[PDB]
Symmetry: none
Subunit: 90 residues, 4 copies
Amino acid sequence: HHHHHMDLVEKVKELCLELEEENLAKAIERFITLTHGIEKTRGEAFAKASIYGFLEGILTTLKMKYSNEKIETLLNEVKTAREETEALLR
Amino acid sequence: HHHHHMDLVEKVKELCLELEEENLAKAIERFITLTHGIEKTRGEAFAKASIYGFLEGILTTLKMKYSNEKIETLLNEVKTAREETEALLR
Amino acid sequence: HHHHHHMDLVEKVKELCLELEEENLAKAIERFITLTHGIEKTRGEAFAKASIYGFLEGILTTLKMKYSNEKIETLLNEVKTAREETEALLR
Amino acid sequence: HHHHHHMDLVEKVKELCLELEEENLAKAIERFITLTHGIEKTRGEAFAKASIYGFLEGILTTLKMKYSNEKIETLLNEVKTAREETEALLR
């Protein structure tokens, strides 16, 4: 099992609450909010790489101020989403 | 006073140590190293949006901890570089 | 901060030229951005952006020597800022 | 017919500014060029030249919006030539 896309961006914003990090999550929403145009102008992979990377940033430093199973689990999940996103077919 | 590319990345890995987050700096080094081919494979904006998003994710979370003037500074600098990177010419 | 980028920043500059009566100038930009579309194809984005942005700097700089409107410097700073990001590399 | 290229082109233009009483404009070209120094080593020569030339044309263009000097038009077409050549690929 593994979360993906908008789903994954939620399992994360979520864990941010469990960590009592309110603004952190509000930011994630404000960030994904702006990463709205990128979509059409640059394409889907570019749009995912930004967000997935941004979520990688977070889950990365959180994994320092806390040590839950969740974080690592998610971080590895998001990390996999990134690796799929940038990979090219041909 | 704005930084860019490798430089802005360096001035961020730097704030990490200043913050006593060596592992974090190590992480960025890893991230930047793993971005490696992306620039080749997907392009420069992709590689940039990818790494800048990550840096902004680290920074956005730290800002939810320490309160240095640097952090909010390096943040607006990262967001601005991400914005320019994603903008299209026509 | 509130920096403008790419086509949008270009668009701002043209506008500013209008807000200054300078029309043939605003008309000139379009002429320039148009006669430089393929560049992106052959040299890429950074190169394309470095030509247009440098071009806007040149415009914004000689006007800042004719008028006083704060919008000029504010705008000049952004194009300069955009140039710098565009030319920076990750190594 | 021989035309100006690179550094000399930068000078002829910087010179025209002086002969128009706009030395600040001239000092700008000076500082622009300074700032655009290592870029040559990072993005290549074609890149460095396209930014500086676009910059020069941006000036020559808006300049032309305030003077009837014959030199400007020619000085403009020259910078235009320099660019066309610079951005062209050997393929």
